[PDB]
Every structure is written in structure tokens, then in C-alpha cells.
Write an enzyme that holds these catalytic residues in place. Structure first.
Site, short mmCIF file in Angstrom:
data_model
loop_
_atom_site.label_atom_id
_atom_site.label_comp_id
_atom_site.label_asym_id
_atom_site.label_seq_id
_atom_site.Cartn_x
_atom_site.Cartn_y
_atom_site.Cartn_z
N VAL A 19 0.86 -1.22 0.07
CA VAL A 19 0.18 0.00 -0.02
C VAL A 19 0.98 1.27 -0.03
CG1 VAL A 19 -1.70 1.33 1.12
CG2 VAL A 19 -1.85 -1.34 1.23
N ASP A 20 0.95 1.90 -1.00
CA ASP A 20 1.76 3.12 -1.30
C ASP A 20 1.08 4.43 -1.66
OD1 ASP A 20 3.85 4.94 -1.83
OD2 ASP A 20 4.99 3.51 -2.81
N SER A 21 0.52 5.19 -0.76
CA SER A 21 -0.05 6.32 -1.30
C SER A 21 0.75 7.39 -2.23
CB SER A 21 -0.53 7.04 0.00
OG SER A 21 0.82 7.73 0.63
#
Lengths: 115, 120
Positions: A19-21
Site C-alpha cells: 500500500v503506497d499512497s
């Protein structure tokens, strides 16, 4: 601190998604795409094998339509970038250590359950 | 056809200096570039015990969501981003990246993500 990973199922294949914003695009590596049997869905129109426009991803118990590129020499099996985080109105909840999608929370994997 | 979503930035003030912070859940550490540290007058607080890594700032007040939040981050010279809010500080302050409402939430106070026009 432990990096954010969530468990998801793609064609009954367990995938630990990053999960990489800060990532613009969602990316799956070629090895996972082959193991999930998705290479036939790859639009080839360089490292980029192509883009998969729509495939069901079992995340939080729901089949969510995902779109992502396929690349060969990526260490991460699957990156959930900002593109898909916004399309599905997801919530990265670090107060409760979970990823929230339509009132269902996916607890982030503990350090031992990381790739 | 083409479409790119706006990257996540939040406004904050450090020593009364407006800073546009990059929100990156995939980044392990929070990082400010040397140019922003100089403009904010923070070089005196830089710890010299370790593109050269200038050092680490252990605690400095950052006005975010109306609150003076203690932040810790490294200082790097050749970084394009003025300030990166990494997972260390996102978890330390129990933040929430809310992309349904397009805001960063701290203590039920929301910081709306900057529109594309206000991006660096």
C-alpha cells in the site's frame, strides 16, 4: 516501523499487496501475473509488459475491480498505488492499523507475515 | 485517453513558514530537503551523527491540522520534495489518509489534500 501490506486474493491466488499512497500507478510484477494466470489480459499497447484494464481482486472479502500495469523486474508482487486507492475511496487508517474499503477494514499484515 | 490522479500534499507551517508536505505511506522515513530546512531556520537543530545526509531533527513543532505536532525527520540535500511525511510519522501521530473525503485526518481534524493547482 512495519511497512503497509494487505492480504488479497486474485484468481484464488494469495497476494500480499504493498500500500503506497506516494505511488502514482498500481503495478504487479510479471511473476505474480503469471502465477495468477493473468498474462492473457495484458494489453501490450522496455520493462512495462502492459496494462490490465479490469480484473476482480478479492480484498476485504469483496471482489473489487482493479487496474494495474505488469512489469517484470519489480521486487514487489503487487503495489496498490494512489490511482486505485482513490477510485475505490479507500482509507489508510493508521490509528487502527487497517485499510478500510466501504466500511470493511483489512488489518495490515504483521512484520512476520511480510514478503 | 489519459488521466492522472493528484498526488497527496497537505499544507503545514514550520517556524511560521508554509511547507507543502508530501504524504507517502510507502516511505519508511520522513525527509525534508536542505533548502526547506534553511528557509525554516532548522539547521541549528540538525544532529551531526547521521547527496549527503545532513542529519536528523529529533523534535520540532509542525503546525498541522491547527495543532503544533512534534515531528522528527532527516535532512537531505538533493531531494526534490520539500518535506516527505513517511510512515514513521503517519503512525506516530495516528493519522488517517482518507481518500473518500480527500483529507488527512488527525484527532478528527481534517487537512484537505491540496488541489493540483496548489501543488509544488
Amino acid at each position: 516501523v512495519t511497512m503497509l501490506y494487505v492480504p488479497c486474493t486474485i484468481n484464488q491466488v494469495l497476494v500480499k499487496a504493498f500500500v503506497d499512497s506516494g505511488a502514482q500507478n498500481s503495478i504487479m510484477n510479471k511473476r505474480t501475473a503469471e502465477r495468477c494466470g493473468l498474462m492473457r489480459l495484458v494489453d501490450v499497447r522496455q520493462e512495462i509488459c502492459g496494462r490490465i484494464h479490469m480484473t476482480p481482486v478479492n480484498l476485504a472479502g469483496m471482489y473489487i475491480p482493479f487496474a494495474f500495469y505488469v512489469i517484470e523486474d519489480q521486487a514487489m508482487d503487487l503495489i496498490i498505488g494512489l490511482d486505485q486507492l482513490k477510485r475505490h475511496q479507500m482509507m489508510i487508517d493508521l490509528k487502527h492499523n487497517c485499510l478500510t474499503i466501504d466500511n470493511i477494514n483489512v488489518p495490515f499484515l504483521p512484520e512476520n507475515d511480510l514478503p
